Design a protein around this ligand. Structure first.
Ligand SMILES: *[C@@H]1O[C@H](CO)[C@@H](O)[C@H](O)[C@H]1NC(C)=O
Ligand SMILES: *[C@@H]1O[C@H](CO)[C@@H](O)[C@H](O)[C@H]1NC(C)=O
Lengths: 48, 50
């Protein structure tokens, strides 16, 4: 099972992580049943 | 979840993921209704010494 927990927080700090407490609610449980050992973030380009 | 008790209206606001509430004795104090999706508070029956 792939558990995804998430939290959205409105912050106003410029650079680093803010210092505080925020518990993450469970969002979605996925019945995947597969081996995972590596991950990669996906970004978006801006074209002009 | 089999049990015996009195079902009352529950003031407690359960989070959407949460479906059960466990007391200090790990016994369900409250259960989220599987048909009307509301919270019901279980209290034990009036046991006493005679
Ligand atoms: C999962 O993948 C890793 C990396 O290849 C491997 O070492 C491991 O044996 C795999 N486990 C299973 C149960 O396939
Ligand atoms: C059936 O279940 C849904 C939620 O699971 C609920 O909103 C609906 O009222 C139920 N229908 C009846 C007839 O109880």
């Amino acid at each position: 099972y792939f558990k995804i927990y998430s939290k959205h927080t409105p912050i106003n700090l410029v650079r680093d992580l803010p210092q505080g407490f925020s518990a993450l609610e469970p969002l979605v449980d996925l019945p995947i049943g597969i081996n995972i050992t590596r991950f990669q973030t996906l970004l978006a380009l801006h074209r002009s | 979840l089999t049990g015996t008790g009195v079902l009352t209206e529950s003031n407690k606001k359960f989070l959407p993921f949460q479906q059960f509430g466990r007391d200090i004795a790990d016994t369900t104090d409250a259960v989220r209704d599987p048909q009307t999706l509301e919270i019901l508070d279980i209290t034990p029956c009036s046991f006493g010494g005679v």
